[PDB]
Amino acid sequence: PKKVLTGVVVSDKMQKTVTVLVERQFPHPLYGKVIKRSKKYLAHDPEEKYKLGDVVEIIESRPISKRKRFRVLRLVESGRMDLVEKYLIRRQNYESLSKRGGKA
Amino acid sequence: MVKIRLARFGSKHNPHYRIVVTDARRKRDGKYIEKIGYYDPRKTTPDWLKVDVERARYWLSVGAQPTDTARRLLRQAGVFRQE
Amino acid sequence: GRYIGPVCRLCRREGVKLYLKGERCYSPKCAMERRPYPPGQHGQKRARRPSDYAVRLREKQKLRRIYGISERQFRNLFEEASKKKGVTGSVFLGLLESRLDNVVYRLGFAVSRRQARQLVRHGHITVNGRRVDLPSYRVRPGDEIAVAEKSRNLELIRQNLEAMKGRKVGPWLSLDVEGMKGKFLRLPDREDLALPVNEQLVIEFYSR
RNA sequence: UGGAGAGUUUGAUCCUGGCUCAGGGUGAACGCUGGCGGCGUGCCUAAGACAUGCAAGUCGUGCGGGCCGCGGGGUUUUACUCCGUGGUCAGCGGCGGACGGGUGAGUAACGCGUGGGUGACCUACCCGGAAGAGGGGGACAACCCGGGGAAACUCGGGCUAAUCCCCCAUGUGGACCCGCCCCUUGGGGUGUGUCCAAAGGGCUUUGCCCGCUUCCGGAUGGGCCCGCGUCCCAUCAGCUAGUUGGUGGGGUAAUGGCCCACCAAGGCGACGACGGGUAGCCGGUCUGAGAGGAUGGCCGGCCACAGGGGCACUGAGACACGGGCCCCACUCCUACGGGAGGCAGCAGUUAGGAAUCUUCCGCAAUGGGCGCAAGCCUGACGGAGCGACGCCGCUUGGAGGAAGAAGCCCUUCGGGGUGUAAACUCCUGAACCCGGGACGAAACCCCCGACGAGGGGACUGACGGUACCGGGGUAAUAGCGCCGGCCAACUCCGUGCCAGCAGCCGCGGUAAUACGGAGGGCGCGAGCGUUACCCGGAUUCACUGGGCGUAAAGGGCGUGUAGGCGGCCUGGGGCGUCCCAUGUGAA
Numbered sequence: 001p002k003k004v005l006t007g008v009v010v011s012d013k014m015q016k017t018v019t020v021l022v023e024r025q026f027p028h029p030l031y032g033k034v035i036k037r038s039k040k041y042l043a044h045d046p047e048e049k050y051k052l053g054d055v056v057e058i059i060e061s062r063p064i065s066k067r068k069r070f071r072v073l074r075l076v077e078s079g080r081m082d083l084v085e086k087y088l089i090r091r092q093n094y095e096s097l098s099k100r101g102g103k104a
Numbered sequence: 105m106v107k108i109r110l111a112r113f114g115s116k117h118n119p120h121y122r123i124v125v126t127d128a129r130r131k132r133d134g135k136y137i138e139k140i141g142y143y144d145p146r147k148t149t150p151d152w153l154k155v156d157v158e159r160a161r162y163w164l165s166v167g168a169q170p171t172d173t174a175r176r177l178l179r180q181a182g183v184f185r186q187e
Numbered sequence: 188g189r190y191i192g193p194v195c196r197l198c199r200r201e202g203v204k205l206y207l208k209g210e211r212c213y214s215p216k217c218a219m220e221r222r223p224y225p226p227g228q229h230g231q232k233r234a235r236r237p238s239d240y241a242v243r244l245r246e247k248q249k250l251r252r253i254y255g256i257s258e259r260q261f262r263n264l265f266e267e268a269s270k271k272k273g274v275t276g277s278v279f280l281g282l283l284e285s286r287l288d289n290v291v292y293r294l295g296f297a298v299s300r301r302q303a304r305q306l307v308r309h310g311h312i313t314v315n316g317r318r319v320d321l322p323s324y325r326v327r328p329g330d331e332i333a334v335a336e337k338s339r340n341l342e343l344i345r346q347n348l349e350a351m352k353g354r355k356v357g358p359w360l361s362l363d364v365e366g367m368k369g370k371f372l373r374l375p376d377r378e379d380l381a382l383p384v385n386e387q388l389v390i391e392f393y394s395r
Numbered sequence: 396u397g398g399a400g401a402g403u404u405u406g407a408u409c410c411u412g413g414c415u416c417a418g419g420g421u422g423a424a425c426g427c428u429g430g431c432g433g434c435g436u437g438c439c440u441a442a443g444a445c446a447u448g449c450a451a452g453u454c455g456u457g458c459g460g461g462c463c464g465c466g467g468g469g470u471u472u473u474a475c476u477c478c479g480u481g482g483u484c485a486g487c488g489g490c491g492g493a494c495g496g497g498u499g500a501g502u503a504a505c506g507c508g509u510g511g512g513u514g515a516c517c518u519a520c521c522c523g524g525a526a527g528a529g530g531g532g533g534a535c536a537a538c539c540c541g542g543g544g545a546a547a548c549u550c551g552g553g554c555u556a557a558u559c560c561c562c563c564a565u566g567u568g569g570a571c572c573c574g575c576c577c578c579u580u581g582g583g584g585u586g587u588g589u590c591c592a593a594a595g596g597g598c599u600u601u602g603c604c605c606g607c608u609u610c611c612g613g614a615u616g617g618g619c620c621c622g623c624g625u626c627c628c629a630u631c632a633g634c635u636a637g638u639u640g641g642u643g644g645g646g647u648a649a650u651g652g653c654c655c656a657c658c659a660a661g662g663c664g665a666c667g668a669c670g671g672g673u674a675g676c677c678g679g680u681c682u683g684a685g686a687g688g689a690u691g692g693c694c695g696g697c698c699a700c701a702g703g704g705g706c707a708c709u710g711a712g713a714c715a716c717g718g719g720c721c722c723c724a725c726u727c728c729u730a731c732g733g734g735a736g737g738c739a740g741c742a743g744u745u746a747g748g749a750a751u752c753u754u755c756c757g758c759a760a761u762g763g764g765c766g767c768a769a770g771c772c773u774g775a776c777g778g779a780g781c782g783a784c785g786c787c788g789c790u791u792g793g794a795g796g797a798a799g800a801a802g803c804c805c806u807u808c809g810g811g812g813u814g815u816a817a818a819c820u821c822c823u824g825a826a827c828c829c830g831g832g833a834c835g836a837a838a839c840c841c842c843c844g845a846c847g848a849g850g851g852g853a854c855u856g857a858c859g860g861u862a863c864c865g866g867g868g869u870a871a872u873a874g875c876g877c878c879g880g881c882c883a884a885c886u887c888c889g890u891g892c893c894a895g896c897a898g899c900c901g902c903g904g905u906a907a908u909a910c911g912g913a914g915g916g917c918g919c920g921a922g923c924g925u926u927a928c929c930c931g932g933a934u935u936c937a938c939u940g941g942g943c944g945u946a947a948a949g950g951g952c953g954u955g956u957a958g959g960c961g962g963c964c965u966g967g968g969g970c971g972u973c974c975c976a977u978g979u980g981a982a
């Protein structure tokens with residue numbers, strides 16, 4: 001079975017390609033509690049069909065590039081920029097964590 | 105090619121062989137494809153040879169080639185007895 | 188023997204008759220009677236309240252010396268009786284009692300276990316018919332323990348199986364004084380051993 | 396079939412808390428001691444340097460020769476010349492040299508583990524099935540002739556065979572473009588066009604054996620991709636320009652920025668990017684009641700590496716440890732121009748080090764390469780050798796033997812200890828001697844049958860005159876540590892805060908069970924101590940399984956970002972969770 005993942009498109013910024021964000025719960029090996037944990041896949045979108053916010057199943061597939069080894073299989077739930085926004089703030093944060101601050 | 109041969113398993117002066125299928129290129133004692141028999145050349149017990157002609161015949165049919173004393177042992181278990 | 192050396196000086200340390208030296212231990216000469224205190228200069232003094240460790244030590248010594256086994260040999264048995272299914276206390280005592288060197292002394296082929304050790308190392312003993320000269324050999328039930336064919340009439344095994352005429356053999360062994368055979372019927376029921384030793388303590392020692 | 400605790404803070408106490416011990420382990424080393432055997436095991440340091448020998452070849456049943464012999468021919472004889480046969484050498488050619496063997500330097504990575512994918516692929520030798528080999532042509536070594544170099548070696552000229560090279564044919568079939576059908580990533584059909592085959596050898600010679608060609612399948616081996624797992628530092632916080640994606644090329648067995656040109660401006664990171672440190676990964680090992688911790692040494696699997704750094708050739712496979720080229724560092728040769736090397740193969744030497752083995756025997760067995768076979772090669776391997784380095788078995792005797800020698804040691808001067816220990820009586824008989832003496836080995840091969848099944852026969856042992864069996868037969872090594880508490884075991888003398896001990900607590904300042912010796916005692920025993928390291932006791936990083944008023948520990952206070960967490964009722968989904976089946980979990 002080619003692995004199939006389900007995720008949120010969080011990047012349209014590429015030609016014929018979408019960043020897909022894929023979460024996975026699971027219990028922590030030593031301490032028990034259920035930990036969320038996520039990873040971004042680059043997926044092949046040849047119609048530039050799928051759009052920011054779409055929730056797509058992504059499938060294992062023969063390599064298209066470095067990075068691109070998945071193709072967008074189908075569309076689950078169309079539109080939902082909460083996830084995109086959720087993800088978006090997470091990278092907004094990054095700005096703070098450095099050597100200075102104030103209004104930066 | 106894949107061979108049917110002996111794999112040395114006893115101890116110093118206590119030889120027991122496993123009759124094995126394996127690519128000819130393994131070491132004689134390394135990872136093998138399938139054990140299909142055993143041989144105690146000292147006949148220390150009543151049960152000193154054992155084959156499984158069914159599997160032995162299988163591997164022959166896909167062209168495993170047995171070493172000269174493997175085939176001797178295989179014959180002795182009537183792998184080849186066709187009557 | 189394996190210890191090899193003053194024997195009745197251990198008789199006196201453990202404070203119990205041990206019967207290591209065979210038949211003089213039945214005579215009014217075994218030191219345990221009319222000299223029952225430990226060896227050494229201070230052996231007749233007011234003996235201090237012995238520690239918890241001391242007591243578990245001595246009971247082990249008490250057992251190990253009675254069988255004439257080493258210690259590396261002893262420990263290797265207890266541990267085998269640990270890992271073994273069943274009550275590890277009296278599974279120990281059964282193995283100990285399965286040692287050929289001891290089984291020979293049980294069948295009264297020799298007056299002691301030490302004298303029984305020598306008869307084994309010197310090929311005077313058959314098991315099932317072939318010679319076995321290993322005092323540690325494990326007698327299994329069904330096995331028949333003979334005096335060696337060409338030994339049968341040595342000056343010693345003559346006068347020793349002569350004592351065994353009419354004498355009684357443990358419940359778990361038969362014996363046939365005519366041809367000088369003997370059989371190991373069953374590993375001993377803990378009740379069968381009159382062993383002057385609380386083996387519960389010996390388990391407790393090997394777990395510090 | 397599974398969990399023990401103790402010593403040490405005080406005049407005493409309870410608690411917190413660290414330190415220490417007792418247990419297990421070892422590729423060990425050091426000290427004292429050391430008898431036999433079986434089986435394991437043995438450079439932890441310099442992936443430093445290496446003398447010498449041996450370590451991958453084989454095939455005359457692919458081919459033609461040179462050299463040294465012998466024999467038979469053509470002639471009336473010689474000369475010249477033809478044929479056969481023995482040895483030998485390399486050459487051309489095939490297959491092997493990509494396995495086997497060594498090491499862990501690098502590597503934190505799809506390297507490894509685990510589970511998947513390949514409609515994106517390869518696979519020599521092997522097995523199965525289908526079909527085929529008809530013509531013709533060429534060259535290069537060998538050899539012959541010359542040159543150059545000191546040498547390693549090298550240049551030119553001429554001849555020639557082949558299972559070496561090529562051209563035409565045959566087209567079962569296949570490859571490629573385009574189309575069409577079914578499939579659905581580049582899977583399977585089908586039509587036209589184009590393109591593509593082959594090698595001969597041996598005979599117990601017409602018909603067998605060994606080869607050759609194309610295609611389809613199997614089997615074995617492999618490439619590549621993916622999910623998930625894989626150490627320490629955040630006193631490393633930002634990183635990236637083939638970077639990230641596209642189009643089209645190149646390249647490959649094949650996917651891919653793998654590489655290139657052009658275009659878009661992406662990609663990554665607090666779920667730890669980038670950087671630094673360390674490290675081969677796993678099966679497993681050790682420890683632990685478990686959960687954990689520790690580790691990767693023997694053996695097995697993967698990876699990587701072959702003085703250091705690049706590289707491609709050949710080929711089914713290599714970017715090749717005993718192949719090629721270049722650069723660097725060493726050592727050697729050198730006629731000063733130039734050359735030759737590469738033990739991390741087996742032994743062995745030297746250096747470093749606390750420390751790590753024989754320049755052994757054998758191809759008898761198992762296994763590998765080539766050969767139809769006979770056979771050849773095989774420091775793989777099977778054995779032997781050294782070291783108590785580990786494990787296991789075994790011996791230094793057994794039974795009797797005093798109211799209880801002698802010496803030594805205490806003493807309350809009576810005695811008491813060493814002590815049934817010795818002496819001694821009898822008994823057995825490790826060592827040693829004599830004799831017999833293996834298993835491992837039945838195949839290849841030859842005969843019968845049919846080169847099948849089946850039967851018959853012969854050959855073969857390094858270990859080894861060993862194992863073991865039988866006959867003789869001698870009383871035949873004991874050491875080391877410890878005795879204040881924890882911790883089993885106390886007396887005398889010497890010593891005087893000295894000499895010394897000491898794991899921790901603490902001993903010794905003139906009556907020391909703590910130092911040194913003696914007698915005795917305890918524990919182990921061919922071994923016993925020491926050091927070093929690991930887990931344990933350590934619920935002393937606490938998930939199981941801890942804490943923070945005063946013991947160490949609440950942030951000076953808030954705000955509220957990420958994140959963590961979330962009241963009662965109904966319904967859907969079924970991610971978490973649970974269940975059954977099944978596959979995997981090699982040895």
Ligand SMILES: [Mg+2]
Binds near residue numbers: 404
């Ligand atoms: Mg205080």
Ligand SMILES: [Mg+2]
């Ligand atoms: Mg005090």
Ligand SMILES: [Mg+2]
């Ligand atoms: Mg106290």
Ligand SMILES: [Mg+2]
């Ligand atoms: Mg050895």
Ligand SMILES: [Mg+2]
């Ligand atoms: Mg090394």
Ligand SMILES: [Mg+2]
Binds near residue numbers: 449
């Ligand atoms: Mg050789």
Ligand SMILES: [Mg+2]
């Ligand atoms: Mg010739």
Ligand SMILES: [Mg+2]
């Ligand atoms: Mg030749």
Ligand SMILES: [Mg+2]
Binds near residue numbers: 503
């Ligand atoms: Mg790194």
Ligand SMILES: [Mg+2]
Binds near residue numbers: 505
């Ligand atoms: Mg993987």
Ligand SMILES: [Mg+2]
């Ligand atoms: Mg075929």
Ligand SMILES: [Mg+2]
């Ligand atoms: Mg020429």
Ligand SMILES: [Mg+2]
């Ligand atoms: Mg050809």
Ligand SMILES: [Mg+2]
């Ligand atoms: Mg043609």
Ligand SMILES: [Mg+2]
Binds near residue numbers: 674
């Ligand atoms: Mg390293």
Ligand SMILES: [Mg+2]
């Ligand atoms: Mg624990």
